[PDB]
Amino acid sequence: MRPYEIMVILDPTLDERTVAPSLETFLNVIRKDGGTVDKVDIWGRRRLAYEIAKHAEGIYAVIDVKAEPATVSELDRQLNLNESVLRTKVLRTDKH
Amino acid sequence: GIRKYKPTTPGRRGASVSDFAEITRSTPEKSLVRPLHGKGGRNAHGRITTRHKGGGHKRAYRVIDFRRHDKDGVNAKVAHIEYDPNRTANIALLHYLDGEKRYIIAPQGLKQGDVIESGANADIKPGNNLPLRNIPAGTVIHAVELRPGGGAKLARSAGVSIQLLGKEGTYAALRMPSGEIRRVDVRCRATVGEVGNAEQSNINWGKAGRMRWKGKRPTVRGVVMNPVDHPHGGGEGKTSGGRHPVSPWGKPEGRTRKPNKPSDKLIVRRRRTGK
Amino acid sequence: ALTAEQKKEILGQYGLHDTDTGSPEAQVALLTKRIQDLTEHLKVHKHDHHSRRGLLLLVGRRRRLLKYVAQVDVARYRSLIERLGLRR
RNA sequence: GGGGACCCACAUGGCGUGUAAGCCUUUACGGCCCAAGCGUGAGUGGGUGGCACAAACCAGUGAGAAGCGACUGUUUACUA
RNA sequence: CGUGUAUGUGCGUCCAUGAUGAAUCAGCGGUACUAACCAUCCAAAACCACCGUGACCGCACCUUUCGGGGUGUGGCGUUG
RNA sequence: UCGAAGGUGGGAUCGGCGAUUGGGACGAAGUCGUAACAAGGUAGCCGUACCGGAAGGUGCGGCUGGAUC
RNA sequence: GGGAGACUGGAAUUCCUGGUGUAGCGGUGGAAUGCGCAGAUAUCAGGAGGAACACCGGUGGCGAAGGCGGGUCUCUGGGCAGUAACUGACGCUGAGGAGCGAAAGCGUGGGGAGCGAACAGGAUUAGAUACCCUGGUAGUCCACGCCGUAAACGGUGGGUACUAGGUGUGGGUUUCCUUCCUUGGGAUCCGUGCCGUAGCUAACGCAUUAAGUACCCCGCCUGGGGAGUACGGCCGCAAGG
RNA sequence: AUCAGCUUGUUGGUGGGGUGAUGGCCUACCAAGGCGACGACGGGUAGCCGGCCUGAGAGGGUGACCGGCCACACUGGGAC
Ligand SMILES: [Mg+2]
Ligand SMILES: [Mg+2]
Ligand SMILES: [Mg+2]
Ligand SMILES: [Mg+2]
Ligand SMILES: [Mg+2]
Ligand SMILES: [Mg+2]
Ligand SMILES: [Mg+2]
Ligand SMILES: [Mg+2]
Ligand SMILES: [Mg+2]
Ligand SMILES: [Mg+2]
Ligand SMILES: [Mg+2]
Ligand SMILES: [Mg+2]
Ligand SMILES: [Mg+2]
Ligand SMILES: [Mg+2]
Ligand SMILES: [Mg+2]
Ligand SMILES: [Mg+2]
Ligand SMILES: [Mg+2]
Ligand SMILES: [Mg+2]
Ligand SMILES: [Mg+2]
Ligand SMILES: [Mg+2]
Ligand SMILES: [Mg+2]
Ligand SMILES: [Mg+2]
Ligand SMILES: [Mg+2]
Ligand SMILES: [Mg+2]
Ligand SMILES: [Mg+2]
Ligand SMILES: [Mg+2]
Ligand SMILES: [Mg+2]
Ligand SMILES: [Mg+2]
Ligand SMILES: [Mg+2]
Ligand SMILES: [Mg+2]
Ligand SMILES: [Mg+2]
Ligand SMILES: [Mg+2]
Ligand SMILES: [Mg+2]
Ligand SMILES: [Mg+2]
Ligand SMILES: [Mg+2]
Ligand SMILES: [Mg+2]
Ligand SMILES: [Mg+2]
Ligand SMILES: [Mg+2]
Ligand SMILES: [Mg+2]
Ligand SMILES: [Mg+2]
Ligand SMILES: [Mg+2]
Ligand SMILES: [Mg+2]
Ligand SMILES: [Mg+2]
Ligand SMILES: [Mg+2]
Ligand SMILES: [Mg+2]
Ligand SMILES: [Mg+2]
Ligand SMILES: [Mg+2]
Ligand SMILES: [Mg+2]
Ligand SMILES: [Mg+2]
Ligand SMILES: [Mg+2]
Ligand SMILES: [Mg+2]
Ligand SMILES: [Mg+2]
Ligand SMILES: [Mg+2]
Ligand SMILES: [Mg+2]
Ligand SMILES: [Mg+2]
Ligand SMILES: [Mg+2]
Ligand SMILES: [Mg+2]
Ligand SMILES: [Mg+2]
Ligand SMILES: [Mg+2]
Ligand SMILES: [Mg+2]
Ligand SMILES: [Mg+2]
Ligand SMILES: [Mg+2]
Ligand SMILES: [Mg+2]
Ligand SMILES: [Mg+2]
Ligand SMILES: [Mg+2]
Ligand SMILES: [Mg+2]
Ligand SMILES: [Mg+2]
Ligand SMILES: [Mg+2]
Ligand SMILES: [Mg+2]
Ligand SMILES: [Mg+2]
Ligand SMILES: [Mg+2]
Ligand SMILES: [Mg+2]
Ligand SMILES: [Mg+2]
Ligand SMILES: [Mg+2]
Ligand SMILES: [Mg+2]
Ligand SMILES: [Mg+2]
Ligand SMILES: [Mg+2]
Ligand SMILES: [Mg+2]
Ligand SMILES: [Mg+2]
Ligand SMILES: [Mg+2]
Ligand SMILES: [Mg+2]
Ligand SMILES: [Mg+2]
């Protein structure tokens, strides 16, 4: 029950439309477990600083999460396992 | 873990064993036991095929589901992680949902209570066998097969198992415990996680009775062998044979790997030791 | 570290009244809950010497408080030690 | 290094077993005790005999150094 | 252990009580095929303003006797 | 029964001597060396491990009781 | 940057593979052992593995002290300010005892890119078993145990109360020129640098973060070698303490 | 403490003997403890005190003579 900030970068081979269904399906596990609140905003197609995974561009998605550490760890484990994702992290919105 | 035995007798002073606190049942399933016997290091022909081994403690056999492919889509809980001495590792029986129980190799850190799936939908907890189509590159794997569906043969060492490197085209690359890379099909069967009993390497043998039990026979050194019996034979005193060591069977140290295997083209380079 | 919910629950539930918080009873209650919880944590985390320092400090502090309770009143000391089920 | 045999007393002693009888009940090929009966070691005193009281048979010699081999093991059946 | 006698309990096939079960016609999963509405982030067919100037046209100074060349500004063009 | 003296047997302390060996100090003067004191010509020292007739050298970590810039 | 576990990032070194590309590359006060003509150096592409986190980064923060810094998560200690609700002599230091502890060293089992004792050569010197160059075995990394010593220094044990200031930094409460932006101004407590009174000290020097003036307890010292050594005792498998 | 545990009539109670007098002073029977880091048990030295010397004092050294006790009579014991 603590506010979390997560950003997800996806491979550019996927179109912009598929991102929203993919992200909502990914976070349905947290939606159905803790009864949480979320906020989603999207902006993609930015030139990357360097090559990552032999790729030059990507899409950025940022979600504000108010959930359980177990739930966010489960999302991280389920999501980093995916091949279409490149880099992710989770932070604390509050003081710590 | 590891428990060291106190020196009650001069013989068992150094004997230390890996205490098997990972045991749950003591009497193995009677249905799956097949008739087996110590072959004594001899073929049916009667000649001793390989010395230094044979005799000892007659033991039973049990079928392990090394090649688990027949049933998929059904879960199974860890029934009882019992002890099978016919292997360095342990075997943990499973209650599958169809009621057909098979032994499997017990991976590292497996305790009773986890649910194991064997198929495409299986997740990444250890004990899940699944083809390379459904595994990330870089995960530690064990009980690895060589073709899509012909029975698994490799990667069953206790403590260190094969590590997947990457997939390109229809061929997948596997890293060996020796530090080598082998090319293998992207559709072979492989499990996730290391194999348990990593502390078994910390076992201390202890005496000769345990060893006749385990199977090996005492080793006879060539330098005291007779010259007719061995190229190292002969001498009045201790002599090394006056020549480089050679197996008394004719060939000395050197290359033994006959090339041109069907998987020789599926190997990049050979092992290099002590680097 | 304990937080508001369970900590106010403990201070009230072992409190002499509904307002007092610094009573030795509540102090020992907080110390005991902290030590069992974080000892459970250290049963997993072995080599946290900086936290074992906290263990030893809080335990000596606890020992001083228990000695004070025993000195001031034997009956309250016995009641406290019996209600928490410890040895001393 | 000391005691060890026999007799008496402590001793109708302690211990085990367990009948009659007693206690009890889901009453039975039932649980508790158990006078009586049977078996029974241990010790302390007093006395006695012989040169000698584990008296027969049976039944470790001990101690101090140093060499080799860690030890239990196996081998030149029929010279080691 | 193994063969037979037939009487007594006694059972259906050829009647039929029970327990059920299953291979047939008529549509739906606010989810949400298709012209939009409200809210949010970015930019392809360069409009306005400044700055840097491939290269071009040159004004003033320095430099070898004049030459190359260097320094400030203007007109664009935009290697970008 | 006790009982001093005497004799059996193995443990502690004080010792005396003991081939030879290890170390230390004082002699005076000689060979081998340059160690330290000035950025002593490789900054010094401390803990530690290895090496070398010798003072010492090196590795790792720590201090400035180190001079220039 | 308090500690522990897990996940993850980039640059660099080395090695391997494949182009291109030619006779040198590396080296010091100078040169030679070193690798090349079997194709080095250089350079591009890819991969592998191990260590450590340049800038921020400071006479700055934290920790009791050793020490501590790529990010992310997980759990957790310590400290600080205000309200002051409550406990009402619980405070301090602490012989013997117990726990933590730089690097190196040891056992077991793994790892091992770079660096680097030992050891080979090449170089200087009358001489080098060193300083210099080319290589490189332990170790340096990981997990579990061990030894428990450092110029372990602020060469100053801790705690409390008092005693003139100036100049920076960090953290938090307030109030007022008030834009109410402002290291604006003021008050307050904690931490940390520098210079300075009275005072102390043999001097250098310390100077509210005292070596100032005192109180409480604890360890240590009584001329230099012998000697932090022999014996004895304790710990450690040993080195050894 | 470069001496950390000591003790078995040892400790305590009861009943007997014992001695001028109470008492493990001696015996029997019951229980397991007492002394121990505010230095026990061990090791070396030595008669103690009023006094003497030194020092302003504190203190340090010491036990000549005399005098108050203590212990011994070649060594070890025992008793009238
Ligand atoms: Mg042994
Ligand atoms: Mg079998
Ligand atoms: Mg034949
Ligand atoms: Mg063999
Ligand atoms: Mg046999
Ligand atoms: Mg096994
Ligand atoms: Mg052999
Ligand atoms: Mg032989
Ligand atoms: Mg031959
Ligand atoms: Mg033969
Ligand atoms: Mg021979
Ligand atoms: Mg010979
Ligand atoms: Mg050979
Ligand atoms: Mg290999
Ligand atoms: Mg906290
Ligand atoms: Mg009976
Ligand atoms: Mg009755
Ligand atoms: Mg009953
Ligand atoms: Mg006689
Ligand atoms: Mg034998
Ligand atoms: Mg033998
Ligand atoms: Mg034979
Ligand atoms: Mg013979
Ligand atoms: Mg024979
Ligand atoms: Mg013989
Ligand atoms: Mg002597
Ligand atoms: Mg002598
Ligand atoms: Mg000279
Ligand atoms: Mg010098
Ligand atoms: Mg020199
Ligand atoms: Mg020097
Ligand atoms: Mg020096
Ligand atoms: Mg040293
Ligand atoms: Mg060296
Ligand atoms: Mg250093
Ligand atoms: Mg100096
Ligand atoms: Mg850890
Ligand atoms: Mg290449
Ligand atoms: Mg290259
Ligand atoms: Mg490596
Ligand atoms: Mg009040
Ligand atoms: Mg305090
Ligand atoms: Mg204290
Ligand atoms: Mg104290
Ligand atoms: Mg002490
Ligand atoms: Mg102390
Ligand atoms: Mg400890
Ligand atoms: Mg310890
Ligand atoms: Mg180190
Ligand atoms: Mg270390
Ligand atoms: Mg060593
Ligand atoms: Mg080790
Ligand atoms: Mg090793
Ligand atoms: Mg090197
Ligand atoms: Mg070097
Ligand atoms: Mg060589
Ligand atoms: Mg050399
Ligand atoms: Mg010291
Ligand atoms: Mg330090
Ligand atoms: Mg200190
Ligand atoms: Mg103080
Ligand atoms: Mg202040
Ligand atoms: Mg003054
Ligand atoms: Mg003065
Ligand atoms: Mg000052
Ligand atoms: Mg002060
Ligand atoms: Mg002073
Ligand atoms: Mg000397
Ligand atoms: Mg000394
Ligand atoms: Mg000694
Ligand atoms: Mg009496
Ligand atoms: Mg009386
Ligand atoms: Mg008495
Ligand atoms: Mg008596
Ligand atoms: Mg006097
Ligand atoms: Mg005086
Ligand atoms: Mg005096
Ligand atoms: Mg006197
Ligand atoms: Mg007189
Ligand atoms: Mg008198
Ligand atoms: Mg006498
Ligand atoms: Mg006498």
Curated annotation (Swiss-Prot), chain B:
Compositional bias segments (type: Basic residues): 36-57, 268-275
Any Gene Ontology biological process: cytoplasmic translation
Biased composition annotated in UniProt, kind: Basic and acidic residues: 252-267
A Gene Ontology term for the protein's cellular component: large ribosomal subunit
Record keywords: Ribonucleoprotein, Ribosomal protein, RNA-binding, rRNA-binding
SMART domains: Ribosomal_L2, Ribosomal_L2_C
SS bond partners: none
DNA-binding keyword on record: no
InterPro entries: NA-bd_OB-fold (IPR012340), Rib_uL2_dom2 (IPR014722), Ribosomal_uL2 (IPR002171), Ribosomal_uL2_bac/org-type (IPR005880), Ribosomal_uL2_C (IPR022669), Ribosomal_uL2_CS (IPR022671), Ribosomal_uL2_dom3 (IPR014726), Ribosomal_uL2_RNA-bd_dom (IPR022666)
PROSITE patterns: RIBOSOMAL_L2 (PS00467)
Pfam families associated with the record: Ribosomal_L2, Ribosomal_L2_C
PANTHER family referenced in this protein's UniProt entry, alphabetically: LARGE RIBOSOMAL SUBUNIT PROTEIN UL2M, RIBOSOMAL PROTEIN L2
Function (record text): One of the primary rRNA binding proteins. Required for association of the 30S and 50S subunits to form the 70S ribosome, for tRNA binding and peptide bond formation. It has been suggested to have peptidyltransferase activity; this is somewhat controversial. Makes several contacts with the 16S rRNA in the 70S ribosome.
Subunit structure: Part of the 50S ribosomal subunit. Forms a bridge to the 30S subunit in the 70S ribosome.
Protein name: Large ribosomal subunit protein uL2
Swiss-Prot record, chain C:
InterPro entries with a match to the protein in the record: Ribosomal_uS15, Ribosomal_uS15_bac-type, uS15_NS1_RNA-bd_sf
UniProt keyword terms in alphabetical order: Ribonucleoprotein, Ribosomal protein, RNA-binding, rRNA-binding
Molecular function GO terms recorded: rRNA binding; structural constituent of ribosome
SMART domains, alphabetized: Ribosomal_S15
The keyword Oxidoreductase appears for this protein: no
TM helices/strands, residue ranges: none
GO biological process: translation
GO cellular component entries: cytosolic small ribosomal subunit
Annotated Pfam families: Ribosomal_S15
Subunit structure and binding partners: Part of the 30S ribosomal subunit. Forms a bridge to the 50S subunit in the 70S ribosome, contacting the 23S rRNA.
Function: One of the primary rRNA binding proteins, it binds directly to 16S rRNA where it helps nucleate assembly of the platform of the 30S subunit by binding and bridging several RNA helices of the 16S rRNA. Forms an intersubunit bridge (bridge B4) with the 23S rRNA of the 50S subunit in the ribosome.
Family: Belongs to the universal ribosomal protein uS15 family.
Protein name, as recorded: Small ribosomal subunit protein uS15
Gene: rpsO
